[PDB]
A paper describes a structure:
CaM is a highly conserved Ca2+-sensing protein encoded by three independent genes CALM1, CALM2 and CALM3, and all three encode an identical 16.7 kDa 148 amino-acid-long protein. The dumbbell-like structure of CaM comprises of four EF-hand motifs, each able to bind one Ca2+ ion. Moreover, Ca2+ binding induces a large conformational transition in CaM that exposes hydrophobic patches within the helices of the EF-hands, which permit interaction with a wide range of targets.
The CaM N53I variant was discovered in a large Swedish family with a severe dominantly inherited form of CPVT-like arrhythmias. The Ca2+/CaM-WT–RyR23583-3603 and Ca2+/CaM-N53I–RyR23583-3603 peptide complex structure show subtle differences in the mutated region. However, these differences do not result in major structural differences in RyR23583-3603 peptide binding (RMSD 1.31Å), with the most prominent difference being the side chain orientation of amino acid Glu54 and the disruption of the hydrogen-bonding (H-bond) network near Ile53. In Ca2+/CaM-N53I–RyR23583-3603, the interactions of the main chain atoms N Ile53 and O Gln49 are retained. However, as isoleucine (Ile/I) is a hydrophobic amino acid in contrast to asparagine (Asn/N), which is polar hydrophilic, the water molecule W1, which forms part of the H-bond network, is lost in the N53I mutant CaM. Interestingly, O Ile53 then forms a direct hydrogen bond with N Asp56. We observed unique H-bond interactions in the Ca2+/CaM-N53I–RyR23583-3603 complex involving residues Glu84, Leu39 from CaM with Arg3597, and Arg3595 from RyR2. Since electron density for the side chain of Glu123 and Lys75 was not present in the x-ray structure of Ca2+/CaM-N53I–RyR23583-3603, the interaction of these residues could not be deciphered. The salt-bridge interactions in Ca2+/CaM-N53I–RyR23583-3603 showed no differences compared to the Ca2+/CaM-WT–RyR23583-3603 complex. Based on our findings, we propose that CaM-N53I likely acts through a loss of direct inhibition of RyR2 (subtle alterations in local structures), whereas for the CaM-A102V mutant, there is a finely tuned balance between loss of direct inhibition of RyR2 (higher Kd) and increased channel activation via CaMKIIδ phosphorylation.
Residue numbers in the entry:
A (entry chain BBB): 1 to 21
B (entry chain AAA): 5 to 148
The structure:
Amino acid sequence: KKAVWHKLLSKQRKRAVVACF
Amino acid sequence: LTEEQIAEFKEAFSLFDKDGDGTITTKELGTVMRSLGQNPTEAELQDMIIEVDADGNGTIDFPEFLTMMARKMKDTDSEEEIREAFRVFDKDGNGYISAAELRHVMTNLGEKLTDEEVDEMIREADIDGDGQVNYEEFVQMMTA
Ligand SMILES: [Ca+2]
Ligand SMILES: [Ca+2]
Ligand SMILES: [Ca+2]
Ligand SMILES: [Ca+2]
């Protein structure tokens, strides 16, 4: 499902932000 | 530095500041991290807040977040985020996402998987039918 591709991108974007802290 | 870049950072801030009160707390940070397949201790959350919290009020406002985001961010636009996500996902760096690499990503990000779901995700993105997802195929799934 495209939704799961989208979910993975959204989650990875957040991890990339968490890593800047 | 551009408003395009600042607006993109502002959108990310809004993903941590759920209540919209203009501050990120240790509670909001942990909430996001526990949704991302991480399991931080209180001490870890406190350590991450103090490192960003310039005025020392114990929360992170947008100016503090922007400062943090500007130092080691790259371009940080919609295209750049999709590229950096692909580079993390493509563990062996051959420019293709395999079924085994997708399983690793799902596990890393706290997403439950099945072989059938992974097979269907590759099938729906795999324009050139080689059985793996290249950058062009990844873009098309993500932008659309
Ligand atoms: Ca808040
Ligand atoms: Ca502060
Ligand atoms: Ca690969
Ligand atoms: Ca392909």
